Design a protein around this ligand. Sequence first.
Ligand SMILES: [Ca+2]
Length: 273
Amino acid sequence: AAYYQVVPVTANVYDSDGEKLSYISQGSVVWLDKDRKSDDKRLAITISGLSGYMKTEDLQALDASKDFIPYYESDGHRFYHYVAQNASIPVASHLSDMEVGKKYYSADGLHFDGFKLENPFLFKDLTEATNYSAEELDKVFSLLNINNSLLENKGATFKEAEEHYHINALYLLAHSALQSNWGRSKIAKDKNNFFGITAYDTTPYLSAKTFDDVDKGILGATKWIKENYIDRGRTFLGNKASGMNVEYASDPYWGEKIASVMMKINEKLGGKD
Ligand SMILES: [Ca+2]
């Protein structure tokens, strides 16, 4: 087949030496890479920018005439990634080279056969501060109709985290927005954990770290991200080939999803970043 889906809760992606490069989630769809050798035991695949090998034991062949394969499509205003059959995210503005309502396929969401996208927030250095003030960040809750969020009116805490730890506050707001549903997930509400800190795929709720209150959750997650990712050379969101997404989450499109939120917030707040 041309496309395969991940069967177990997570599966590893390996290099040609058998070393682990990353891991991806159940249901993820990988592309067969016809430029490298596959065998009965391992398939040469590509996912979210990463070219490696996966065990056939971890995969099920798809038929693209009847099974969902992730794709990109323009509505004539924004270009969307269908990351699941019933879920799309905006990743870029419409380009004149895009046909409205036509499905496009890409292993990285950057290179398409007739156009190339810039996803600047995906690769932005997260140690550079945002140009948004605390009050500006707080305005986006009303502008995006975000109701009953634990993160409402926390712009000052995000900017304090940025000041102390040197991590972009727009990224911190976007990461917490995406991963905890704007601080409305059960992990957010029960554990003040807005960033999926130690929320491992096997037992995400039980494994998730607990923080003392909302502010200590923002600051404590920022400390954890600084110490475990930024200080270890993972300084941008990225994908399965480079950046925080290699290790932070099994979801191949975690980085793209956070970059999409950054893009949405940035547009609502007047394009200062
Ligand atoms: Ca190696």
